[PDB]
From a paper:
Here, we identified monoclonal antibodies (mAbs) capable of cross-reactive binding and neutralization of animal sarbecoviruses and [name]-[name]-2 variants by screening single mouse B cells secreting IgGs that bind two or more sarbecovirus RBDs. To deduce recognition and neutralization mechanisms, we used single-particle cryo-EM to solve structures of Fabs from the seven cross-reactive mAbs complexed with a [name]-[name]-2 6P spike trimer. Here, we characterized mouse mAbs elicited by mosaic ([name] mAbs) or homotypic (HSW mAbs) [name]-nanoparticles using both structural and functional analyses, showing that mosaic nanoparticles induce potently neutralizing antibodies that cross-react between animal sarbecoviruses and [name]-[name]-2 VOCs. Structural analyses revealed neutralization mechanisms, potentials for intra-spike trimer cross-linking by IgGs, and induced changes in trimer upon Fab binding.
[name]-28, which showed the lowest degree of cross-reactive [name] binding, mapped to the class 3 epitope instead of the more conserved class 1/4 and class 4 epitopes, and except for [name]-6, it showed the lowest levels of cross-reactive sarbecovirus neutralization of the five mAbs isolated from mosaic-8 immunized mice. Single-particle cryo-EM structures of the [name]-28 Fab-spike complex were determined in two conformational states: a 2.8 Å structure with each of three Fabs binding to a “down” [name] and a 3.1 Å structure with two Fabs bound to adjacent “down” RBDs and a third Fab at lower occupancy bound to a flexible “up” [name]. The Fab-[name] interaction was mediated by all six CDRs, plus FWRH3 and FWRL1. Although [name]-28 potently neutralized [name]-[name]-2 WA1 D614G, Beta, Delta, Omicron BA.1, BA.2, BA.2.12.1, and BA.4/BA.5, it was only weakly neutralizing or non-neutralizing against other sarbecoviruses, consistent with its epitope spanning more variable [name] residues than epitopes of class 4 and class 1/4 anti-[name] mAbs. The identification of a class 3 [name] epitope for [name]-28 rationalized its potent neutralization of [name]-[name]-2 variants and limited neutralization of animal sarbecoviruses. By contrast, the class 3 epitope of [name]-28 was exposed in both [name] conformations. Likely related to these observations, only the [name]-28-bound trimer structure showed an inter-protomer [name] distance of 31 Å equivalent to that of an unliganded trimer (28–40 Å). (I) [name]-28 Fab-WA1: closed trimer conformation with no potential for intra-spike crosslinking. The epitope identified for [name]-28 resembles epitopes of the class 3 anti-[name] therapeutic mAbs, as evaluated by comparisons of common [name] epitope buried surface areas (BSAs). Some of these mAbs, including [name]-28, neutralize Omicron VOCs, but their epitope locations within a region that varies among sarbecoviruses suggests that future [name]-[name]-2 variants are likely to include substitutions that reduce or completely abrogate their efficacies.
Numbering used by the authors:
A (entry chain B): 26 to 71, 74 to 178, 187 to 290
B (entry chain B), C (entry chain C): 971 to 1018
D (entry chain B): 729 to 776
E (entry chain P): 1 to 9, 11 to 30, 35 to 59, 62 to 72, 74 to 127
F (entry chain Q): 1 to 29, 36 to 57, 65 to 72, 74 to 80, 83 to 109, 114 to 126
G (entry chain C): 291 to 580
Amino acid sequence: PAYTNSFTRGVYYPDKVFRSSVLHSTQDLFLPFFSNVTWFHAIHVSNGTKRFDNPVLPFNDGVYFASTEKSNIIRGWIFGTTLDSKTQSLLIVNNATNVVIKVCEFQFCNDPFLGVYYHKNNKSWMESEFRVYSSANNCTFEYVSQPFLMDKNLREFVFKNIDGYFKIYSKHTPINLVRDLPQGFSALEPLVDLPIGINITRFQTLLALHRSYLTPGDSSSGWTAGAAAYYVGYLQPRTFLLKYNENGTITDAVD
Amino acid sequence: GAISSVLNDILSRLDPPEAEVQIDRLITGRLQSLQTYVTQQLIRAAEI
Amino acid sequence: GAISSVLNDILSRLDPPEAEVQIDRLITGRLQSLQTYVTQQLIRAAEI
Amino acid sequence: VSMTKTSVDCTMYICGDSTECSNLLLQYGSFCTQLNRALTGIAVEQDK
Amino acid sequence: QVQLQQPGAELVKPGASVKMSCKASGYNFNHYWISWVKQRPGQGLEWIGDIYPLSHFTTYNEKFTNRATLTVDTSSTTAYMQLNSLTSDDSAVFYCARWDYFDSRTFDYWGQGTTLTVS
Amino acid sequence: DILLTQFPAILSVSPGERVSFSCRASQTIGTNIHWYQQRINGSPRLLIKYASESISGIPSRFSGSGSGTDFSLSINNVESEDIADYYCQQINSWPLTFGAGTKLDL
Amino acid sequence: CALDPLSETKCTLKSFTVEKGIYQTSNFRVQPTESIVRFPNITNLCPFGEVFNATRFASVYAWNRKRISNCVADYSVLYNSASFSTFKCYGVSPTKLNDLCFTNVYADSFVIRGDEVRQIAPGQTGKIADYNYKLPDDFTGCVIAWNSNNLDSKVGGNYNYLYRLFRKSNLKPFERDISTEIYQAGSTPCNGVEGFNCYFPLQSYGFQPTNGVGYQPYRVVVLSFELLHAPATVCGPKKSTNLVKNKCVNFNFNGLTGTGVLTESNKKFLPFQQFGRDIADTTDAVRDPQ
Ligand SMILES: *[C@@H]1O[C@H](CO)[C@@H](O)[C@H](O)[C@H]1NC(C)=O
Ligand SMILES: *[C@@H]1O[C@H](CO)[C@@H](O)[C@H](O)[C@H]1NC(C)=O
Ligand SMILES: *[C@@H]1O[C@H](CO)[C@@H](O)[C@H](O)[C@H]1NC(C)=O
Ligand SMILES: *[C@@H]1O[C@H](CO)[C@@H](O)[C@H](O)[C@H]1NC(C)=O
């Protein structure tokens, strides 16, 4: 796993209060400036041979997540303390049509995946099935809205679990960088708060499977599952000095 | 020490018997702030 | 903030455990009064 | 030779339009009057 | 076996009270709620109220919160409702079902149905 | 106050087919629906408890599914004794409410 | 002191004779012309019946939390009703709840006993607090409890109600566990249902109709209000008046209960933020709820 340095990335809006032309200092779980964030290559295809890597990642304090997938190979995320032994788990699934957030207790296998096929008549890749979980058990929450993971492009997410509530921040920005996070600054807007009182200490990602891979054989033809580059960083208790411009946007920050 | 630094958020959201203690905390803090500012201004005025 | 501004009145009509809080309020107020007076006197004495 | 001739409204600073806060400030004595008098003295001193 | 006895086809003048009889046997009377349902001929079931025989706690429907008053006789294990001002519209079938509380709340046993009519 | 409605107020069925009903509640209740049947000049009888599992003495054709707000009643096979009035009852909180009414036709 | 400015000067100086000069007597403030109240266009009543009128309450170990939002909440009827024996509000005032607006209200319902009703409070130590239900230290909201002896007590005991008796570690606030894993203690010799120094985590208790008041079942509902930092969805039953600008008014924007003159703003609020503060942490810009 590559170890890329996150420069001027991982800063969100501390609160839902409009501030303009004011330098505001806030103490909250933040991604440290110029911190070492682990880079994972989810899938690399070389002859029908693919390198699949979706390891479990500890959810200590917050977690900063960024993806550069042009084809949206990375879709949704899995949370939960152990994902077994009748323990509560948290799941997000993102299909093309709409974001189907399914926050339900689940039993997960080692390999997480979703199904999608190609219709020759419509010339589109519409989802075939939902082959993520065996069944829905004691599902407490569910949310559907416009999908955020779609609409080359960098998608930054911060997940935080304090006082039971699950906080998710997001901001989408197209980037021309290829191998490293761009040396620019973006602020993550609060997206949605999840009111589920569960334990989250490990983390995992979910990848798309087109009709090419949906075949039981390992060899896949016709679909390029190579645009998989997601970076993971762990938040820390930090104090940040936030610069608000006259428009209210956080232009810069100081750790 | 008060529940909120906004005076109106204490006048509302609380009954007068229970709001008065928070108002007293805010009043003590702000009066100390003015006393500090006025002492600094008096010393600065002596220097000027 | 005390019930009365007279120390003897607070000493009466109140048990010591409940009179002590009012005495503390009076003591804090009067100590602030002396500190303000002494600071003003020091500044005025510097001017003089 | 002089500095900015600022003035502070003690009642408007400690309290906004609130009247309960104004009454609780009233029971604290004449601290606001002393602060306003000191600031006015500073102002007249700057003019002098 | 469990059987709930409920006489029906009672004739009462409008504007007078009725004393429904709901005799139940075959189960422990203190471990199960018993309820009443009003059904117009050719119309859906309408809730009336519930009761706790052990503590004599009752809940009434909003429409029947004042007209229908419910009482229970623990000695005879028979529930009653009385002191109501009947009208011509009140002509309907009055059931008496046993509510399976403390467990799957299912209305396990139903009565034959008291087909009260007025004229 | 929870309110229940059935879109198929009257339904016509043929012997041996599969049909499904509907019962949506005003507020989410989490599997607190009991489906009842009332034959002509008869008394209501419990069929499916908590809208998911069934009880003894009921034919396996009566199958219930649904959770949250929208609930359904499914019957595998239709015979002569399946023509009755099927009612949806919510039991989550007082006041208890019954369905508007569903009728079966041959 | 208000007859004429000379008399105001005489009052300020505490003398009936004033000398030549200019005297700072008092302050001039434009009094508000009218009172403005602006609440969102929500009209439907909140489903508080489904929380309090519930047939059975969930156990303490696995309670039920309900999302009360996008509705008008009337807490006056809740407070005025004498059914609830304990109605304690911590961060708010029970009589001021109708004038406020909240972004989200969550009701947690569970059944406890009279000896453990005091454990439902911020900063409390006890069996329920440590192992079953912990309230945050900065808890703002109300705690509602009433006797359920007439509701849940049964002859021979009611065994549908469970409280955890043993846990490895204390619970953080608003933490629910449904593992039901067997408790291992001592030298850790228990890997099955029963073992040495081993017990079942869920200790059931039966409520008797003639049991003591301290052991009687108590139905508890706690409303966890989170105050106004985001746009409001649940509000009190306050009528909304017409918006008026360029006039000093006592505006009440979702319970902000400020005072000032309102003007059109060119500042672009982000969708997730509804208030605009300043250096002194006073509301400078607001977004109209309607
Ligand atoms: C989550 O993991 C275990 C239980 O699954 C626990 O020991 C740990 O403290 C928990 N961490 C939290 C709640 O942050
Ligand atoms: C602020 O917004 C204005 C338009 O209202 C725009 O012209 C200007 O470039 C913006 N400045 C920044 C720093 O975003
Ligand atoms: C609970 O039921 C009673 C009786 O119907 C009713 O008066 C009360 O208002 C209900 N509770 C709430 C919170 O509405
Ligand atoms: C009614 O509510 C809608 C939804 O927010 C709002 O756009 C509209 O302005 C409201 N009506 C009035 C008269 O303000």
